[PDB]
Design an enzyme around this catalytic site. Structure first.
Site, PDB file in Angstrom:
ATOM      1  N   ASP A  64       0.839  -1.198   0.000  1.00 12.08           N
ATOM      2  CA  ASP A  64       0.000   0.000   0.000  1.00 12.08           C
ATOM      3  C   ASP A  64       0.873   1.248   0.000  1.00 12.08           C
ATOM      4  O   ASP A  64       1.334   1.671   1.059  1.00 12.08           O
ATOM      5  CB  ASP A  64      -0.892  -0.019   1.238  1.00 12.08           C
ATOM      6  CG  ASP A  64      -1.851   1.163   1.286  1.00 12.08           C
ATOM      7  OD1 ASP A  64      -1.929   1.886   0.276  1.00 12.08           O
ATOM      8  OD2 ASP A  64      -2.510   1.352   2.340  1.00 12.08           O
ATOM      9  N   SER A 119      -0.702  15.550 -11.927  1.00  8.30           N
ATOM     10  CA  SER A 119      -0.917  15.205 -13.322  1.00  8.30           C
ATOM     11  C   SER A 119      -1.157  16.475 -14.136  1.00  8.30           C
ATOM     12  O   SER A 119      -1.721  17.463 -13.649  1.00  8.30           O
ATOM     13  CB  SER A 119      -2.168  14.302 -13.462  1.00  8.30           C
ATOM     14  OG  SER A 119      -2.469  14.013 -14.830  1.00  8.30           O
TER      15      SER A 119
END
Ligand SMILES: CN(C)c1cccc2cccc(N(C)C)c12
Ligand SMILES: [Cl-]
Ligand SMILES: [Cl-]
Length: 330
Positions: free
Chosen positions: A35, A199
């Site tokens: 994770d 992004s």
């Protein structure tokens, strides 16, 4: 040193991925959820409330000649999905795919929430976010990657998740045969303890690419791709019959649909998520309404590039002095 281990989806939908991890002496192999969005290595154990264990493999520290109780240490974690676990702490030897850390903090669960009990395939989590998020008290502990980093050939790990198929976590090296083109690296903020990046935009299907900054985390422990409401609305507007369902808890679409791809920007580069990766199947057994893999982050406070996004790429978690994130097509 290096390590390399195969990671496998836990089910038909790629809800999560498990990777075998050796703990203790003699080795006890547990299948953990790696994770990148958390920083605790915790396991189901001989100490877990019996009613809360339902098929998982358990770590028994009393059977490990290298296990040492970390005196007075406890841990307690709650995840974005509402699940929770807590317990005490040992240090023990932990190996992933040939790479060994001695004295790793192994957080033994005394209590887990119902969703963990109900998932027989996940024996615990191996956190790979930054150690500042580790929950051990009163002395915070380091992640497996943090402990291993100085020994690695290169201070990196890579995630190469498969779509309905096995994949690989590598530590200490970049497999240049595992991707096409080049790796584009992008800046990371560690201020919230996550692999947090920006992004450069998105496109839906064959549509025009929208240049827009999307701050989010690279989180292998989250199944879906959570993005701003405007972006998600633009995606599902391309799917005939798709609607946001209050009762189901997100966007759903007719299972007879063929979904458009989703592109996200990494600098000037582009990662294309095939439409099939966005289909998470019937909302309930036998339904013809299917659950979408791209959902709104509006009720989160952060965008999450979960498995839906990461599995479309070869992803470098670069733990150099200034961490960065790399993405390549594959
Ligand atoms: C498809 N599926 C199992 C789901 C159906 C309805 C709601 C969901 C909410 C969150 C996550 C889900 N997963 C994909 C596990 C959901
Ligand atoms: Cl080693
Ligand atoms: Cl760009």
């Amino acid at each position: 040193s290096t390590g390399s281990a195969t990671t496998t989806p836990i089910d038909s939908l790629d809800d999560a991925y498990i990777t075998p991890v050796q703990i203790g002496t003699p080795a006890q192999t547990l299948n953990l959820d790696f994770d990148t969005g958390s920083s605790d290595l915790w396991v189901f154990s001989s100490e877990t409330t019996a009613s809360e264990v339902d098929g998982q493999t358990i770590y028994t520290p009393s059977k490990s000649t290298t296990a040492k109780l970390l005196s007075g240490a406890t841990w307690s974690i709650s995840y974005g999905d509402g699940s929770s676990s807590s317990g005490d702490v040992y240090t023990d030897t932990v190996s992933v795919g040939g790479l060994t850390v001695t004295g790793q903090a192994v957080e033994s669960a005394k209590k887990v929430s119902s969703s963990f009990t109900e998932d027989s395939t996940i024996d615990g989590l191996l956190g790979l976010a930054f150690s500042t998020l580790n929950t051990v008290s009163p002395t915070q502990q380091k992640t497996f990657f943090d402990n291993a980093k100085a020994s690695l050939d290169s201070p990196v790990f890579t995630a190469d998740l498969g779509y309905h198929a096995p994949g690989t976590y590598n530590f200490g090296f970049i497999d240049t045969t595992a991707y096409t083109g080049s790796i584009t690296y992008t800046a990371v903020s560690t201020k919230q303890g996550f692999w947090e990046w920006t992004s450069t935009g998105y496109a839906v299907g064959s549509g025009t690419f929208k240049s827009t900054s999307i701050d989010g985390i690279a989180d292998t422990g989250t199944t879906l791709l959570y993005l701003p409401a405007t972006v998600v609305s633009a995606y599902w507007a391309q799917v005939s019959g798709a609607k946001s369902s209050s009762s189901v808890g997100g966007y759903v679409f007719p299972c007879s649909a063929t979904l458009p791809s989703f592109t996200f920007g990494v600098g000037s580069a582009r990662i294309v998520i095939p439409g099939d990766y966005i289909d998470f199947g019937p909302i309930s057994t036998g339904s013809s309404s299917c659950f979408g893999g791209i959902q709104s982050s509006a009720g989160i406070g952060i965008n999450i590039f979960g498995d839906v996004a990461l599995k479309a790429a070869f992803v470098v978690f670069n733990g150099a002095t200034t961490p960065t994130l790399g993405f390549a097509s594959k």
